[PDB]
């Protein structure tokens, strides 16, 4: 967890403009948050991403756990292996507003972020998932209470993020 160059927004949420990828792999944090959907199929984004990144063994390990657990629900999460990235994949599942999951769910999304002490994450339900990034960052900040390190890998939102924060 030897995190560096974030900027601190609130007691317990930092944000910083880097890939999760290349942020996992230089700190091996405990706990890197994955964006995923409720088969764990982790075609592009931030899954696709990370899942690269191992080489294909999380996506290995995310399909038996899917045969042998089912699907997760929008809203929940499971904990895998980190693989080389970090100790431990917490995959979290946030709405999919461009297909009529509710906003409500991303606040049930970020509450499992509370399960573990520092994480390392992406901004949830951003991207394909069709939710404005800025309200994201809002509902994580007015929801997660461990310490989160986000990682967004694109500087205009990151200023954005920041400017909209202060
Ligand atoms: C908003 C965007 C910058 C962000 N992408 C990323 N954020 C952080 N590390 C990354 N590595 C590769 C992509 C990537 C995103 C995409 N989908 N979701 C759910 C979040």
């Not at 509370?114 to 994450?121: C, K, R």
Request: charged fraction near 20%; proline fraction near 3%.
């Amino acid at each position: 967890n030897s995190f560096s160059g974030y900027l601190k927004l609130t007691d317990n949420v930092y944000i910083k403009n880097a890939d999760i990828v290349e942020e996992a792999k230089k700190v091996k944090p405990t706990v890197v948050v994955n964006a995923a959907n409720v088969y764990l199929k982790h075609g592009g984004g931030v899954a696709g991403a990370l899942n690269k990144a191992t080489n294909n063994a999380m996506q290995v390990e995310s399909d038996d756990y899917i045969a042998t657990n089912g699907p997760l629900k929008v809203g929940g999460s499971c904990v895998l292996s980190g693989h080389n990235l970090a100790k431990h994949c917490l995959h979290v599942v946030g709405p999919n507003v461009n297909k009529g999951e509710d906003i409500q769910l991303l606040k049930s999304a970020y509450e499992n972020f509370n399960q573990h002490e520092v994480l390392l994450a992406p901004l949830l339900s951003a991207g394909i998932f069709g939710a404005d990034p800025i309200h994201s960052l809002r509902v994580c900040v007015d929801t997660v209470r461990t310490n989160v390190y986000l990682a967004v890998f694109d500087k205009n939102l990151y200023d954005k993020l920041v400017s909209s924060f202060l």
